[PDB]
């Protein structure tokens, strides 16, 4: 076939010691164990096309910068970085989303972290000397070494803002990509399905204040009683506009070309034996938004900043710590997603592909949350039984 499973390389993961994740693992131990499970279903089936971030090949000024960062001087790295050519593709696609000054701060931060080997800035972000480089490799590897349909395991993105990171997210790779795709191609129909139990609030901010010119449909499934603890009255406040009831306690907002759908896991609950209506929506909306793109002779681009911390078998506080308790068995059914939902979700999407493979530009699946080792080492295989076929 034609997919690609990007993973961070071993030298890369070895710079993520100490970076916060949602449980007892740090992002090192997490991504170590996940690439292990992919090394499992890759010796089960050497067709699973896994590539590390090391087959990425960067321009000499970038590698020069990383090398200069190691020599410990902030001023030389910055003047060096400042002297990058403004038409370098990487730089061009970063500045489409982030500020230069945030970038420089990540460079200052990486060098300052050289003192004790890490820099804790806010209890949700930890920076290491390697951290800038490993993210550049992660993003570049996806931007140019992409190819249609692409699974990237790597740091989280959706809580990262234009001039700052939060909730484990340093850089918003999902937005850098999307901006990059509309860069010089005919106007696309951008469709986003962010299944992380937490809210795609950084992404949405970035999309809302810079991409109000493109056709985006951001379907955001999240539980408002967990981080970032923002509800429909909040989102009514951002968009300066009351939400439009799309049925089933689901509300859409519009900021120009952006149309943001809050499928609230707590307002929108599973009817008894059924599949969770959240995914059910995503598939219906999607299928609709594709036909709309065929009608307007326009192409589509799909993005899945998905986390598994919305699976019913997560244990992490950002998934199960709601309203003062941990969700019991029963409540886990009606508000969290199960393997049958996911096997329905992904099986659906992949099925939609071959009916409109022409009318696709590229699809991208980006790991976000997911923290219980048992739960993710299994959903990973579930994805790999499905990416296989
Ligand atoms: K979080
Ligand atoms: K979400
Ligand atoms: Zn999450």
Author numbering: 21 to 409
The authors write:
Classical Zn2+-dependent deac(et)ylases play fundamental regulatory roles in life and are well characterized in eukaryotes regarding their structures, substrates and physiological roles. Structurally, these enzymes are composed of a central eight-stranded parallel β-sheet flanked by α-helices on each site, known as the α/β-arginase/deacetylase fold. All active site residues were conserved, as shown by the multiple sequence alignment and the structural alignment, suggesting a general acid/base catalytic mechanism for the bacterial enzymes as described for the eukaryotic counterparts. These enzymes mediate catalysis using a penta-coordinated catalytic Zn2+ ion coordinated by two aspartates and a histidine (KpHdaH (1b): Asp181, Asp269, His183).
We were able to solve two crystal structure for two Legionella enzymes of cluster 3, L. cherrii ApaH and L. pneumophila ApaH. Structurally, compared to the arginase-deacetylase core, LpApaH and LcApaH contain an additional pair of α-helices and the central parallel β-sheet is extended by a two-stranded antiparallel β-sheet. These features might be needed for recognition of the enzymes by the type IV secretion system for secretion into the host cell, or important for interaction with other proteins such as the methyltransferase RomA or the lysine acetyltransferase KAT7 in the host cells, which calls for further investigations. In LcApaH and LpApaH the XGGY-motif is conserved (LcApaH: 388-EGGY−391/LpApaH: 391-EGGY−394). The RPP-motif is substituted by the motif 176-GLPSHH-181 (LcApaH)/176-GLPSHH-181 (LpApaH), however, with highly similar main-chain traces. To this end, differences in the sequences in the region of the RPP-motif might explain the observed highest activity as deacetylase while also being active as depropionylase and de-d/l-lactylase. For the enzymes LcApaH and LpApaH, we discovered the highest deacetylation efficiency of all compared enzymes with kcat/KM-values of 139 × 103 M−1 s−1 and 75 × 103 M−1 s−1 for the histone H4 peptide LGKac, respectively. LcApaH converts the lactylated peptides LGKd-la and LGKl-la with comparable catalytic efficiency for the two stereoisomers (kcat/KM (Kl-la): 0.03 × 103 M−1 s−1 and kcat/KM (Kd-la): 0.04 × 103 M−1 s−1) but more than three orders of magnitude less efficient than its deacylation of LGKac (kcat/KM (Kac): 139 × 103 M−1 s−1). The structures show an open active site entry due to absence of oligomer formation and, as a consequence, the missing in trans supply of the active site lid as observed for cluster 1 and cluster 4 enzymes. Notably, for the cluster 3 enzymes LpApaH and LcApaH we discovered the highest discrepancy in the inhibitory potency between SAHA and TSA, with TSA inhibiting the enzymes almost 80–95-fold stronger.
